[PDB]
């Protein structure tokens with residue numbers, strides 16, 4: 305039988321949790337593989353909808369509602385019928401327990417109402433032509449099971465009944481689990497892989513010893529010096545790194561320390577921090593060349609230059625280029641002056657400070673980026689120190705607002721809104737299920753206003769106008785310190801499977817991570833070799 309070895313997420317121990325709503329604590333093979341989406345939007349190919357459990361959808365002229373047609377004939381793994389009842393339940397379950405809202409769907413969807421057993425109506429809070437894409441982010445679970453659960457917020461869901469390709473838990477240990485074919489998969493005819501095989505891997509250099517040895521099939525991890533280390537080991541060791549999203553230093557505007565708050569909330573300081581960075585050095589050393597300098601103050605990218613008001617970009621490009629002497633003289637003009645003879649600048653109010661910059665434990669490319677930056681900042685007089693907390697701790701720090709500076713990447717969408725909304729909408733700053741991305745706690749009502757209006761109408765210019773509005777607010781306020789535009793790291797082995805997505809066959813985002821819904825479409829193209 306065919307076993308496909310994947311690695312979507314680092315773990316030190318496998319805890320049996322297949323609750324699709326508990327993304328900070330669950331296993332990362334639950335979404336897509338156990339709970340198939342209504343639609344998969346192909347973000348690499350202009351958000352083209354690929355219909356799965358939903359047949360079709362249509363907005364109204366109002367842009368105030370949308371109806372999804374559920375596909376008939378679909379079965380859960382326990383034989384029960386997949387219906388609009390299940391879709392309508394799940395959107396209620398998120399609606400009444402918003403700690404399960406991980407994308408901010410509650411903000412968009414006023415309520416979920418059902419026409420027939422295969423038609424669901426969504427009533428909107430605001431005009432949004434992109435709301436089918438938001439809707440698809442939400443997990444759909446069997447109401448036939450989840451209804452008499454007393455607390456879905458803490459349900460570990462260890463014995464899952466799903467709609468997706470791999471719902472059977474064949475094996476489970478703390479260091480390995482095997483996830484096998486749903487006996488009743490609606491698309492079973494299209495599926496040629498038997499099982500997902502998921503080994504426990506704690507960090508990048510434990511990973512490195514496995515993948516160089518050919519033990520993996522499908523991965524998306526950072527691999528140091530990949531050409532001499534991984535490529536050279538076998539002719540069947542392959543990779544393809546299509547361009548991905550923004551990576552940036554995020555500063556905490558609500559830091560509880562008087563001294564650090566004084567520095568981090570100062571735009572001259574954020575700018576001097578940014579000019580101290582050598583972006584192109586970080587790319588070549590920390591990532592071995594795998595990226596592109598991002599000198600947009602707005603974080604826009606390079607990939608979305610068509611979207612760019614290049615009058616906004618030019619006015620602040622200097623504050624996002626390597627200029628160590630510029631950094632020093634900006635610190636001096638601002639009044640960040642070393643008054644205690646340590647060589648490190650102090651706040652205007654006279655207090656000494658050091659910036660603690662965090663990146664997740666085991667994310668060695670990020671870890672090296674931060675330590676590089678620590679050195680770069682020391683040269684211009686800013687004292688910082690690198691920290692590498694466990695991802696859960698790194699994550700909690702940001703949601704709670706206890707961190708100083710954090711290095712993070714963002715997801716890369718079909719347009720600039722996936723980055724800008726996730727990184728800057730202040731609505732996404734409260735809520736226990738919220739991701740870390742907007743957690744700098746900078747708030748600007750007018751920024752949120754443009755963001756939510758990005759899809760209020762259907763003409764290209766007005767949208768593009770609204771983009772230039774957003775780019776302008778962000779860049780002049782230097783809210784974050786953008787560094788580079790990264791790569792969708794992706795490695796695949798043709799030893800045991802064929803049909804892989806690659807540069808010759810670029811069917812979509814190729815990664816195995818949770819939050820890349822195209823990974824369902826990807827596994828459906830895979831079949832064994834001999």
Ligand SMILES: CC(=O)N[C@@H]1[C@@H](O)[C@H](O[C@@H]2O[C@H](CO)[C@@H](O)[C@H](O)[C@H]2NC(C)=O)[C@@H](CO)O[C@H]1O
Pocket residue numbers: 311312313314508523524525526666667668669670713714715817818819
């Ligand atoms: C947008 C986002 O937050 N993506 C996360 C990924 O970065 C992350 O993958 C990890 O990325 C690190 C930084 O480049 C790598 O060093 C690390 O090897 C890699 N880990 C894996 C398992 O691929 C994944 C998984 O942690 O989470 C994404 O949400």
Ligand SMILES: [Ca+2]
Pocket residue numbers: 493494495496828829830
């Ligand atoms: Ca197929």
Ligand SMILES: [Mg+2]
Pocket residue numbers: 641642643644645646647648649650656
């Ligand atoms: Mg000093």
